[PDB]
Each structure stands twice: as structure tokens, then as C-alpha cells.
Amino acid sequence: SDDMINYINKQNTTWQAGRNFYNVDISYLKKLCGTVLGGPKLPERVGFSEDINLPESFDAREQWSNCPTIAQIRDQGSCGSSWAFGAVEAMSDRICIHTNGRVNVEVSAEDLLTCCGIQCGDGCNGGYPSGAWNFWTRKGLVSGGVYNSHIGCLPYTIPPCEHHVNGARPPCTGEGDTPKCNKMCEAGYSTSYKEDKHYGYTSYSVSDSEKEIMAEIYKNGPVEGAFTVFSDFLTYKSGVYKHEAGDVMGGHAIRILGWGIENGVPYWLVANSWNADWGDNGFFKILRGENHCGIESEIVAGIPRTQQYWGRF
């Protein structure tokens, strides 16, 4: 309802609002916020920021241009899979970063969404980012591109929904069920699913310390994190998101990949998985520092087990 978009703009807040969705059923917006918050956390990382001389601004993208993934923007469709996307997005980034761009793959959102089982949650109905990472360690995940990309072993099977256009009336609606874990690479991929699994050494929590999260990103790479979604976030267009109005939608995970200061306001550079046309080309900035919406509460990350790539790369 446009009324809010205007109230927001009229407030003269750190961010600028506009309309991102057309012809969408509430259920869709609900399924978009696919993250059950407050899950049991992983053991916290030692902490080491004190040594790293953190710059004022960072952007993983510029830092590791040799890693295309760090700018790729996925689409979760009408599935409450963000918990999964934020994970595999960060994972793909690190595999590259940690191998100096010699190894570059797209970790399958599909494999995680369907094969994790109960350990992660309820697939398309929302899951826990913690489990996703803890799974990457135990059973690993194969490669897999975007919907109909035919890239990798298991591309995402849940179809996109052009919620940014306007025409074909069938309103997007958060439906569908979590597909069955078909442990089998798409016909045409030349290598056994079992022999495609990419593993990680270990997954961990990052304290809710602004400086610590910063060090983790700068040293080891982009990380997953979740936050509370409020109606108005849905209208983000640019600027530094600072919850101004609207009620609570639900939780939502994402990939934090940088920080900086804009117009005095400190901000986290975040990549959303609501299709490349949402907000600032798929990305958005949120208030940094004062644990806004809990953006600094549930930081998860991991280090890709580099070993299995040597003899092959």
C-alpha cells in the first residue's frame, strides 16, 4: 500500500523507499522471509579482530574480483529457503577466496534445501542457518546453479516469480512443497553426486561484536546472518535501512559482504536473495553498529576444506 512508501520518504530517513512488489499474495511475502530465528547457536569463534587493522570501508567484491560469485544474486522463489541461500552464497564465495580463485563453483541451494532433512528445519517452510553450515561439514553439498541454468550438478528447481513486473495476473503466492532429496545429479552432468560434494572444515558463530564480524569478513570472507523483517523493509530502494514503520513480517537470513559509511551512517553491505531486481540491484545497506533488527545477532560462517581440490586443480 503506497501510503507507507510515502510516509517513509516523508520521514527523511537514512534510506529511500519505493515499490518492489506487484501482484503478490501475502503468503509470498511470508515465504520470502524464510528463516526461523533464535535457533541453537554454534560454538563461537575465538575472536581476533584486535590484530587486523580494519579499514573504514570494505567490499568483498572489489577485494576478490577474481571471484564472480561475490556479486551473483540468487532467487529463492516462493520457497522459505533464504536460510539455505544465505549459506550456500557465502560458501561459494569462500571456496574461491580461500583457493586464490583457482577453485570457483556455485554450491547448490537445491541440495541443502532438500537433503539436509530435519537437521536444518522444514525446507521451504523456513529453516535454521546454523544447521545448514553444520551440514556442509558433515555431508557437504554438491554444486548447482540457478533455476534452469543447467549449471552444475543440482540447479535450483523452484521457479522464479516476476514480482517486479506487472501483467500476467496470476499473483505470486508462497506455495509449493520442499522437493524430495533426489541424490542424483541432473542428467548431463559428468560426475557422481557423491563425488561432487564440497565440504567445509568447520562452521562457527561470530560474536555480536561489530569489530569482530568486520575482521571475520575481511580475513575469511562474506558471512551469513539473519534479521527481523518489517513491512517497510520490503520497499527498500537505496540508502541505509533503518526500520521506520510497518509491523513484523518474520525472520530472514542473508549474506553480509562488506561495510562502510554513507552520509555519516555506518552500514553493512548486504546481498538479498529476492532476485536481482529488488532494491539496489539485489543488494541493500542496513544500519551498522547498534545491532539493528538483530543483524549482528546470528552471524554464521565457515572455512572450506581446501584439501580435495589440490590433486585436481
Swiss-Prot record:
The active site is at S82, H252, N272. Glycans are attached at N166. Residues 308-313 form a propeptide. It comes from the Eukaryota. The modification N6-acetyllysine is found at K194. Disulfide bonds join C67-C96, C79-C124, C115-C181, C116-C120, C153-C185, C161-C172. This is Cathepsin B. It comes from Rattus norvegicus. The lineage of its organism: Eukaryota, Metazoa, Chordata, Craniata, Vertebrata. The chain holds residues 80 to 339 of 339 of the full protein.
